[PDB]
Design an enzyme around this catalytic site. Structure first.
Site, short mmCIF file in Angstrom:
data_model
loop_
_atom_site.label_atom_id
_atom_site.label_comp_id
_atom_site.label_asym_id
_atom_site.label_seq_id
_atom_site.Cartn_x
_atom_site.Cartn_y
_atom_site.Cartn_z
N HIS A 12 -2.05 5.66 0.54
CA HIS A 12 -2.22 4.35 -0.13
C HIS A 12 -2.67 3.23 0.81
CE1 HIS A 12 2.26 3.91 0.79
NE2 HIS A 12 1.87 2.67 1.06
N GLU A 65 0.30 12.45 -0.09
CA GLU A 65 0.40 11.02 0.37
C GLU A 65 0.24 10.88 1.89
OE1 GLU A 65 0.08 8.73 -1.74
OE2 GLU A 65 0.37 6.99 -0.45
N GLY A 95 6.70 -3.23 4.03
CA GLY A 95 6.51 -3.39 5.47
C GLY A 95 6.88 -2.12 6.27
N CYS A 102 6.16 1.14 5.33
CA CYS A 102 5.30 2.31 5.06
C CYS A 102 4.58 2.70 6.35
CB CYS A 102 4.39 2.12 3.85
SG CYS A 102 5.36 2.02 2.30
#
Length: 182
Positions: free
Chosen positions: A41, A72, A146, A148
């Site tokens: 992402h 992911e 914040g 990730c």
């Protein structure tokens, strides 16, 4: 403060950079040579900022399992003039549960941040922001925006990167040795 935080610090001080995309600042784990990982992402493009230096992306691959399900994890090759310390020997070979993990973050917002998250469940399937996602690890800590890209470690093992949470729990994408064979 103890042996978990010692191993985490060792990883953060040599194997992380601050990555900036158009989607924000992320902790980015360097794994070997010029190869790093970031949550998919982050939307890595042709150019990324690495410690506020404009860097060409030589390759970027959003990983999916053999069921064509999102994992992911994006593996990025950077046009950088310096190699990472090779940490592939710290990566697990199989899906597992773990005790006593630390989540470690380093951004402008959150420098030198270490969180003792406790037990880590092999959770498996998660609907992550509406996207079906596999190989998810769960820990009972209220993680926040914040975090990730944050690195999840035990003593001796680099097990995952932080990809989301629901306000009570946090969720990490597994790292496996087999992602980084060359």
């Amino acid at each position: 403060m103890g042996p978990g935080f010692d191993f985490a610090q060792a990883i953060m001080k040599k194997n992380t950079v601050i990555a900036r995309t158009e989607k924000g600042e992320f902790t980015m784990l360097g794994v070997y040579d010029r190869v790093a990982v970031i949550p998919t992402h982050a939307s890595v493009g042709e150019i990324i900022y690495i410690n506020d230096v404009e860097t060409r992306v030589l390759d970027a691959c959003a990983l999916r399992d053999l069921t064509d399900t999102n994992l992911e994890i994006t593996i990025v090759k950077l046009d950088r003039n310096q190699k990472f310390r090779d940490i592939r020997h710290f990566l697990p070979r199989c899906e597992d549960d773990y005790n006593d993990a630390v989540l470690s973050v380093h951004t402008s917002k959150f420098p030198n941040m270490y969180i003792p998250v406790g037990q880590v469940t092999n959770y498996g399937f998660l609907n992550l922001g509406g996207t079906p996602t596999h190989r998810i690890l769960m820990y009972n800590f209220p993680t926040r925006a914040g975090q990730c890209g944050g690195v999840v470690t035990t003593t001796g093992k680099v097990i995952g990167i932080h990809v989301g949470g629901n306000g009570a729990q946090g969720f990490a994408a597994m790292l496996l040795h087999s992602y980084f064979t060359d």
